[PDB]
Subunit: 577 residues, 4 copies
């Protein structure tokens, strides 16, 4: 039977679970073709690889398995979105422009080494239009980075003259004459893709952040008494803002479980006010909810764009509050407004170069080290604005006769007569020196205090120059060690453990390639995701004996069916090798 | 070989055959490994230092123009910020290589209504593109040995 | 120096070679000032580790 | 030096019982075996 076994290997899934006998058992099932196809994608695999990194730095109890299943049912929704969008001599001479073009081409080549990319007939074409934008959002985003370097290159030719060709900011291309009309065209083209980036993001990403948020609220209402039993935290905004969505008649819109309302009513509705549950949480005419599933479900006629006024205003206010507080969407909103504000005849289009960072991979990796210790790195600066001040009060009333700027016959500028203008001298000029405030201050010689100044300067150079700048240069250096040690620990633990059992490779190496197949052939955290897609797409009357046992525990959110400590070989070691 | 052949063109080109000193000695090439271990990342920081400096030029091109003079008496044919291209060249060639930033080579902001927009301007420049963006280049090499 | 040989040498301005000097100085400051002194200051730091 | 201390403190505390000497390898043959061992059984807080 080698032909059929060879042909059906890609589709024959396999997982090991523990249940129904307190013994580990294997489970076989059919992995669909489309489910297999949607898993081998560049987007999904990176999402999975991101999850593995997160779960292994913050790792604990079955919380890991809770995170795994919560991730397992996120990509399922992500897959649903992805399905519905697809249809010794003298060298030459170098002028400024030539060198500028060469160096800018070098910079752009370095960056690109990232390689980033009637009233009824409109509806069918508009859906294709939005499906088009969502389909290619990264390529269109990468296009903005093109136009951010293109516009800024053109902006690199301005000049200032009091007489127009009250200063006049006139361009001055090499008469190529081309640059000026190009800027008008390129700026208009830029703000278009900046607008299209929002619409592409809105129809592609935020359906996944609404589903994610509605997921936990439904979990914390059914399996917890978030708003029923105890309260929210009264300090957490997110736990408080979503109080507005319970009353809405369409609370579980994106999320699958549209009967989560009736579930909490049966659970907490007895020992609590059965009527009071039915007013905190929608359920208008709780009696009519009983009779809703009695006769039938009449279908209203499609009256889109005509009586589409029937929209949950309260729900939409909730949804906007979730979107407008998103960190990524706000950035995309900020990118657009500056481009819009860039058409105010200005350079503001020079701030769209910073995307260079929140873009390239290695470039943002470096910014992580700076921002890894951002909280601590501010304190050192705060400690450098204390120490410098603490020197001012010492030099304000002992060494006043020195902080002059050598104006002849008159001294209107003594930078220590006033405290405020002395603290400004020690911070602006004292720190930025290389010698401290001994370099920019008269030479103490003879002056009875010429040993109270030498002790004063060298202490200043020692403390607020060498040490308090070897910390800022030392916090960044340690940041790289902190981050690289993380990646080494992530790779090490992933390689020497099964991530589903706890068993190390020492036990799975008594046989050749024992561990290599264990995390590939046996339970390998990828058939498990394929198992849930199998159950949810299979009616309950056909669930086999093992499949319904899992489906029972999954709906109870008890994850005891994962092996976690024993895998079919420690179980059956003595029986057959 | 070609440089040696080209060295018989009556020239010094035979002074480029000293670099074999590196692609030769063991410990010497071991040190060059640390420099070239993070070569890909170490370019990006420089690319990030030619962005930040430019991002300061557009701020000083149209707010602090009256400062970037070189004190020529009775005439000022050299204002290093009247043109963008000759301002970005001033901030990169002279601004970075300083030890104080562009506060050391620029008139002293005093009285000028903008003397607090310059102090915030210089110290931010010294903080960001001098201390931090050169503690990374000096920090990428240190981590390479580890 | 702290600037390399651009600090102690006439200012390249106008001179047809004023871009062969700017590339000359900044390369000097980059290579034999920042890098070749972050190694000597980096070999000592690694020694403690 | 200081960060390596904190990493070693968290690591040893997590992989040992602090009252026995037994590591988590023995207390993981059962699901949540170590998690309950340092919570339900002797857990240096009932001792106080
Ligand atoms: Ca059946
Ligand atoms: Zn395992
Ligand atoms: Zn113990």
């Amino acid at each position: 039977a080698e032909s059929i076994l060879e042909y059906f290997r890609p589709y024959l899934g396999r997982i090991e679970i523990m249940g129904a006998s307190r013994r580990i058992e294997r489970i076989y099932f059919e992995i669909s073709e489309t489910n297999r196809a949607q898993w081998e994608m560049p987007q999904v695999k990176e999402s999975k690889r991101q999850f593995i990194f997160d779960v292994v730095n913050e790792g604990g109890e079955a919380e890991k398995m809770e995170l795994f299943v919560s991730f397992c049912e996120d990509t399922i929704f992500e897959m649903q979105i992805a399905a519905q969008i697809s249809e010794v001599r003298r060298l030459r001479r170098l002028t400024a422009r030539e060198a500028a073009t060469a160096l800018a081409a070098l910079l752009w080549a370095v960056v690109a080494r990232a390689g980033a990319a009637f009233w009824g007939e409109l509806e069918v074409q508009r859906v294709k239009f939005l499906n088009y934008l969502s389909r290619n959002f990264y390529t269109l985003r990468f296009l903005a980075l093109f136009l951010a370097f293109a516009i800024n290159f053109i902006l690199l030719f301005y000049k200032v003259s009091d007489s127009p060709p009250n200063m006049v900011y006139y361009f001055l291309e090499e008469s190529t004459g081309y640059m000026e009309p190009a800027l008008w065209c390129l700026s208009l083209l830029h703000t278009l893709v900046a607008f299209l980036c929002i619409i592409g993001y809105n129809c592609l990403k935020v359906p996944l952040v609404i589903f994610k948020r509605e997921k936990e609220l439904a979990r914390k209402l059914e399996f917890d008494g978030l708003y029923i039993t105890e309260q929210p935290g009264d300090d957490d905004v997110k736990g408080q803002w979503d109080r507005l969505v319970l009353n809405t008649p369409s609370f579980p819109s994106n999320y699958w479980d549209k009967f989560v309302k009736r579930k909490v009513l049966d659970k907490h509705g007895d020992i609590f006010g059965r009527e009071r549950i039915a007013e905190l949480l929608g359920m208008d005419l709780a009696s009519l909810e009983i009779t809703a599933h009695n006769e039938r479900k009449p279908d209203p006629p499609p009256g889109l764009l005509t009586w589409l006024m029937s929209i949950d205003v309260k729900y939409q206010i909730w949804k906007f509050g979730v979107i407008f507080t998103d960190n990524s969407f706000l950035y995309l909103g900020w990118y657009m407004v500056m481009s819009l504000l860039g058409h105010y005849n200005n350079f503001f289009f020079a701030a769209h170069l910073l995307d260079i960072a929140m873009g390239v991979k290695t470039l943002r990796t470096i910014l992580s080290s700076v921002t890894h210790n951002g909280k601590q790195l501010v304190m050192t600066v705060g400690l450098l604005a204390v120490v410098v001040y603490l020197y001012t009060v010492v030099a304000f009333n002992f060494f006043r006769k020195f902080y002059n700027k050598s104006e002849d016959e008159d001294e209107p500028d003594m930078k220590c007569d006033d405290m405020m203008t002395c603290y400004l001298f020690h911070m602006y000029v004292g720190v930025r020196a290389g010698g401290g405030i001994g370099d920019e201050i008269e030479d103490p010689a003879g002056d009875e205090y010429e040993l109270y100044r030498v002790v004063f300067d060298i202490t200043f150079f020692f403390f607020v120059i060498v040490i308090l700048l070897a910390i800022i240069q030392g916090l960044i250096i340690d940041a790289f060690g902190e981050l690289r040690d993380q990646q080494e620990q992530v790779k090490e633990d992933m390689e020497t453990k099964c991530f589903i059992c706890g068993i190390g490779s020492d036990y799975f190496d008594t046989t050749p390639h024992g561990f290599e197949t264990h995390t590939l052939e046996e339970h390998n955290l990828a058939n498990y995701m394929f198992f849930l897609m199998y159950l949810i797409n299979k009616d309950e009357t056909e669930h086999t004996g093992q499949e319904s046992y899992v489906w029972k525990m999954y709906q109870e959110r008890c994850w005891d069916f994962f092996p976690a400590g024993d895998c079919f070989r420690k179980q059956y070691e003595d029986q057959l090798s």
